[PDB]
């Protein structure tokens, strides 16, 4: 009797889902593994309790809307969603997904990867991203901890709470001052708050992830965005005025152009034992100027990935996504209503 508890808090997913086991937490959800008694298989279930904060509601609605509409081998699916039968009773949302074994953050924390693993993982990240971007969506928060792996080295991108249609404009305010667990994978233009950034921000993130697979260390850590820029410039060298084309804040632009000159550090000096083709691709992803970054299609065609490259089996969305309304200018009560309606179809009865 009673609903199961995990590390101290209720997990009300029975009777369909039973035998809960803790997996971990992010900044926003707690994730457990569970036995699905309908499909007779173990699954993952992320609990979120977002309805007291506008931004939590935002993350929840975005991830639900986008993932329910994506279908790709290298992107996590949503199998089911549990929440109370009435909007008033609804305080928590349970997102059920395919169960994965680990993520790239934990793996890299202690485990060495061969050049072949690195190559295969990078390929899968990019195959996933090709689909995301083809749907005219930006992930915006790619990092090792939301690259899931199973035991057969299958990789799946998750954690779409910050994903947005690449509405080539749109002003997403608050995004930069909002809490996240790590900012180490963010492109320099987004850290500097340049409205009008593009798909290239994701490519930058992937570049940071590749660097980390090569060395088991983050390439641009830092206590904050200014310190992070100091790491970035220390390796890529000083930017030109043309590089700062996408840096729109006046003082930030002048600050950057005022700094002491920095020479580029060759990639093979930092990564002395890496495949030289990996370093060439890395060099093309981690370019300061967003418009000169290699895009995802050309990246998949890079000589480093030629052994897995196959455009006959790298599927895209049949049509670009177009978000229903605008979620950033909605009260949390409305966002809750939209979440209720978006999850209605999984209710026992519907």
């Amino acid at each position: 009797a009673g609903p199961e508890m995990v590390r101290g808090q209720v997990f009300d997913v029975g009777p369909r889902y039973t035998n809960l086991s803790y997996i971990g937490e992010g900044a926003y959800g707690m994730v457990c593994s569970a036995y699905d008694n309908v499909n007779k298989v173990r699954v993952a279930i992320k609990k979120i309790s977002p309805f007291e904060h506008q931004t939590y509601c935002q993350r929840t609605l975005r991830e639900i809307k986008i993932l329910l509409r994506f279908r790709h081998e290298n992107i996590i699916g949503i199998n089911d969603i549990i929440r109370a039968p009435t909007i008033e009773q609804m305080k928590d949302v349970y997102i059920v997904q395919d169960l994965m074994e680990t993520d790239l953050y934990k793996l890299l924390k202690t485990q060495h990867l061969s050049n072949d693993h690195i190559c295969y993982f990078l390929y899968q990240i990019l195959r996933g991203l090709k689909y995301i971007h083809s749907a005219n969506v930006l992930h915006r928060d790619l990092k090792p901890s939301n690259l899931l792996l199973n035991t057969t080295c299958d990789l799946k991108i998750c954690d779409f709470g910050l994903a947005r249609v690449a509405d080539p404009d749109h002003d997403h305010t608050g995004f930069l001052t909002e809490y996240v667990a790590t900012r180490w994978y963010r492109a320099p233009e987004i850290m500097l708050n340049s409205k009008g950034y593009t798909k290239s921000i994701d490519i930058w993130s992937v570049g940071c992830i590749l660097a980390e697979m090569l060395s088991n260390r983050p390439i641009f850590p830092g206590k904050h965005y200014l310190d992070q820029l100091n790491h970035i410039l220390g390796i890529l060298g000083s930017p030109s005025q043309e590089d700062l084309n996408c840096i729109i804040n006046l003082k930030a632009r002048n600050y950057l152009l005022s700094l002491p000159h920095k020479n580029k550090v060759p990639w093979n000096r930092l990564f002395p034992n890496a495949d030289s083709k990996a370093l060439d691709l890395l060099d093309k992803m981690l370019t300061f100027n967003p418009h000169k970054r290699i895009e995802v299609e050309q990246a998949l065609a890079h000589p480093y990935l030629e052994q897995y490259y196959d455009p006959s089996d790298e599927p895209i969305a049949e049509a670009p996504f177009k978000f229903d309304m605008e979620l950033d200018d909605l009260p949390k009560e409305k966002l809750k209503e939209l979440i209720f309606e978006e999850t209605a179809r999984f209710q026992p009865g519907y």
Partner: peptide, 15 residues
Amino acid sequence: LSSLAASSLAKRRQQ
């Protein structure tokens, strides 16, 4: 983390 040989995608590319 086996040889990627057991991964289905890598297996599809092994053709």
